Design a binder for this molecule. Sequence first.
Ligand SMILES: *C(=O)CCc1cn(CC(*)=O)nn1
Lengths: 20, 74, 18
Amino acid sequence: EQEIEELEIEIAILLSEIEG
Amino acid sequence: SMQIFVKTLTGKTITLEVEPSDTIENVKAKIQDKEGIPPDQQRLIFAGKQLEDGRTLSDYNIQKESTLHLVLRL
Amino acid sequence: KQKIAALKYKIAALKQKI
Ligand SMILES: *C(=O)CCc1cn(CC(*)=O)nn1
């Protein structure tokens, strides 16, 4: 569960940067 | 006064009615009303960073029709 | 482990977009 959360954070960070 | 969008990793978009001066904490409260997700379980991400609860949408330069990204936390 | 592999795959693809 903890490793899934950390990867989800990375994905959201990247999606939000690409949109910037 | 304005709306913003909150997108999950599961392909869902949530529309929120907000004010520029709304705090991130209040935004998380609004997400709880739409989704039932307690604010302590929400990570909100914008412009490549996680958003701190005490600041406002304006402080983070979140504008009308901006999209935040929601990730659950434990 | 499959969920993890799928997430890493997406991360690699997103890092290609930027
Ligand atoms: C939490 O992240 C523990 C590790 C884990 C492994 N899986 C299945 C394979 O991805 N889910 N969570």
